[PDB]
């Protein structure tokens, strides 16, 4: 099940690709009624004045993410959520754990989602418009 945003698609398809977005990277089903920022986001992504990719930063990015995935937890414990909620995966190695840990340390969580998002993997597997999911 792969969902991808274009700008052209009916309302029908992209409520289903912006659901899909919420609950890879929030893990439930969060809508634009949580906050005027998230609103503010999915009109953006709705409407193509940001691709998918810059709409999932922006998500991992927010309140709403920080104090769910990266504030209670240990840089370590992180950054392995981040892994799979941006790039639907684990990390595959202690030097790839070294890699984030040290961007985490130095950039926070702004850093760790752009270098996820901007990683040439991530180019591969989800490009601009598509929906991180699970492999
Ligand atoms: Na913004
Ligand atoms: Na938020
Ligand atoms: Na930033």
Same mark, same amino acid.
């Given at each position: 099940?792969?969902?991808?945003?274009?700008?052209?698609?009916?309302?029908?398809?992209?409520?289903?690709?912006?659901?899909?977005? +919420?609950?890879?990277?929030?893990?439930?089903?969060?809508?634009?009624?949580?906050?005027?920022?998230?609103?503010?986001?999915?009109?953006?992504?709705?409407?193509?004045?940001?691709?998918?990719?810059?709409?999932?930063?922006?998500?991992?990015?927010?309140?709403?993410?920080?104090?769910?995935?990266?504030?209670?937890?240990?840089?370590?414990?992180?950054?392995?959520?981040?892994?799979?909620?941006?790039?639907?995966?684990?990390?595959?190695?202690?030097?790839?754990?070294?890699? +984030?840990?040290?961007?985490?340390?130095?950039?926070?969580?702004?850093?760790?989602?752009?270098?996820?998002?901007?990683?040439?993997?991530?180019?591969?597997?989800?490009?601009?418009?598509?929906?991180?999911?699970?492999?």
């Amino acid at each position: 099940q792969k969902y991808a945003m274009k700008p052209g698609l009916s309302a029908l398809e992209k409520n289903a690709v912006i659901k899909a977005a +919420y609950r890879q990277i929030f893990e439930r089903d969060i809508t634009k009624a949580y906050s005027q920022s998230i609103s503010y986001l999915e009109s953006q992504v709705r409407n193509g004045d940001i691709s998918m990719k810059e709409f999932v930063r922006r998500l991992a990015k927010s309140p709403l993410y920080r104090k769910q995935f990266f504030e209670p937890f240990i840089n370590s414990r992180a950054l392995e959520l981040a892994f799979r909620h941006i790039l639907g995966r684990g990390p595959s190695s202690r030097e790839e754990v070294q890699k +984030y840990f040290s961007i985490v340390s130095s950039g926070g969580l702004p850093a760790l989602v752009d270098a996820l998002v901007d990683s040439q993997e991530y180019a591969d597997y989800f490009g601009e418009e598509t929906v991180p999911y699970l492999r």
